Each structure stands twice: as structure tokens, then as C-alpha cells.
A = this chain, B = another copy of it.
Amino acid sequence: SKVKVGIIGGSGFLFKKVGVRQVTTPFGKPSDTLVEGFVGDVACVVLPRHGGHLIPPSEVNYRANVWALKDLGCTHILATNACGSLQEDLVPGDFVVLNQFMDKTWGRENTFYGSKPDSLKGVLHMPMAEPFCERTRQILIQAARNKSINVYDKKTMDKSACIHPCVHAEGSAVTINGPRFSTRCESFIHKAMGLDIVNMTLVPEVSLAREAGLSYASIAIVTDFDCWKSEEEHVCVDMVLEQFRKSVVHVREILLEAVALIGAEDWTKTIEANKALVMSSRLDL
């Protein structure tokens, strides 16, 4: 019944520290030390995904990061991800509480289970049709409302209500491997598929969190229009850094409010269901 919130911070990334934990996992070392402490009465653990941002997205040890948070007793993970927009409604400065993704990563360790010595014993086939924890998604959305940040829900709001900057209540991300950005050809193809944003760090992090029995939700920071618009609006690293810094302030407020909103509810049945889903997805029984 205990609740403990892990926070995985991307580009641009909270409380007074109780302890710094140098941990190891059976999958290797996490990206950095883990800082443990409290937000109000809620226990919380913070972990930077890139550790002085020297580790590219394809080389982050997502297994060790998620497992380390599980081993410190986290029940939830809140994650941030920098991204580029593929659609006109999503402009730099907006946020997206994602609910879908398309995976184009490769060469990353994306599961804890297998038949090799470097993995846990078993064959795990996890359902991923709706790959995030829906309860935690709505917490992020309500947190933005409580902090007087606009929310745009395309299902129930006219397009004229999309007042920027705003938090988009839904969205799909294509995760590319990096480190290069997309070509205009690739951006047009992803947009034609109906995708909303492009990023590099969401997958396999989201999949491993569900394998570990954790509730996971992501808030993406729109820093650019990818490269499907005008040449002045094409992505570079400086464009990504120049927008993260301005938006980090507001995503901090959202994260800290979401931690408090998580602590204000009972999660006994959701945590139980997270664990049961893993056990029922074991094909080796």
C-alpha cells in the first residue's frame, strides 16, 4: 500500500536530499547515483537519465535505471522527454501527456527476461496496447490544471481552445534511435502515419517499467517542430536546449504537484494488478 515515486529527468534535468545511493543491478550500473528524499510526506527518488549528459539515448542503461528504482521501492515512475512536434497544434513550449507510441529503436536492452545468463529466467510477453498507467496519466493532467497551466483535450474541446502554452491530454510518439535527427522524408512519413511527436528516450523505458510492475507516465516537452516546416524551424541541439530551459520551470511544478496528487490516493489494487499482469504474462508459466 506504500507509495514511492521515482522521477526520471531528461534534458533540462527537486527536494532536499535524505540519502545519495550508489547502487548496482544485475543489469549493470544506472546512469548516475539515485537521490532519495521526500516531497511533502511522499517518498521520492530522482534519477537523471543521461547522468553531465555524456551518455547518448541509444547507450542509456534503461534496464538498470528502472530496476534500480524498483529495488529502492518505487511504485510509480514519472518521466520527462524532450521531443519535436509533427503536428500544427503542438508548438514549442507545449507539453504532451503521451498515451501511445511507435518504436523505431534498435540495439537497446528492452526486456528483463530471457534465456541468456544476463537476464531473468522466463519468457515474458506483456500486453502494450495502452502502454501507460492511465491513472498516473490523469494525475499529470490534473496537476497541470492545479498549477493554472492550460490543458487542451482534443476529444472534448474545440480547436479554438488550444491556447498556448498548453498541456496536450493525449498524443503518440515515434521513438527513433538517435543520435541524428530525422530527415524531412522521415518526418513526412511519421506525420503521414498520424504520429504527434518524435523523441529518442521513451522506449524501452516505458516497456521496462510495466515489466517491473510499476505505474509509468511520461510528460513530453515540445522544443521544436522537427523538420517538416520551414528551414528556420528545423531542429538543432541549440534549439532543443533553448526551449528545454524555458519549459523546465513549468514541468517541475507539474511533477511536484503530481507527486502530491499520487500520495493523496490509495493504490493498493492498482499495484496488485501491476504485479499480477507480469505474472500472468509469463509464457513459460
Contacts and interface: CB of A to CB of B under 8 A. Distances in A.
A232 to B, nearest CB: 11
Nearest to A132: B183
A126 B235 CA distance: 9
Contact of A56 (B53, B114, B179, B235): B114
Contacts of A107: 106-107
Given A55-B123, A129-B181, A185-B194, 11 more contacts: A56-B114, A100-B184, A100-B185, A101-B183, A102-B183, A111-B180, A123-B179, A125-B225, A125-B240, A128-B180, A237-B282
Interface in A262-285: 280-284
A158 interface: no
A243 interface: no
A3 to B, nearest CB: 26
A52 B128 contact: no
Interface in A25-70: 50-56, 58-59
Interface of A: 11, 50-56, 58-59, 100-103, 106-107, 110-111, 113-116, 121-131, 172, 178-189, 192-195, 207, 225-227, 231, 234-238, 240-241, 280-284
A182 B281 CA distance: 14
Contacts of A189: 102, 193-194
A59 B116 contact: yes
A101 to B, nearest CB: 6
A236 B240 CA distance: 39
Contacts of A113: 56, 179
A225 to B, nearest CB: 7
Contacts of A195: 185
A219 B188 CA distance: 23
B234 A181 contact: no
A237 B183 contact: no
Given A54-B115, A129-B181, A193-B189, A280 B123 contact: no
A275 to B, nearest CB: 15
18 contacts: A54-B122, A56-B114, A56-B115, A56-B124, A59-B114, A59-B116, A100-B183, A101-B186, A125-B178, A128-B180, A128-B182, A128-B227, A129-B181, A129-B183, A129-B184, A129-B187, A129-B234, A130-B183
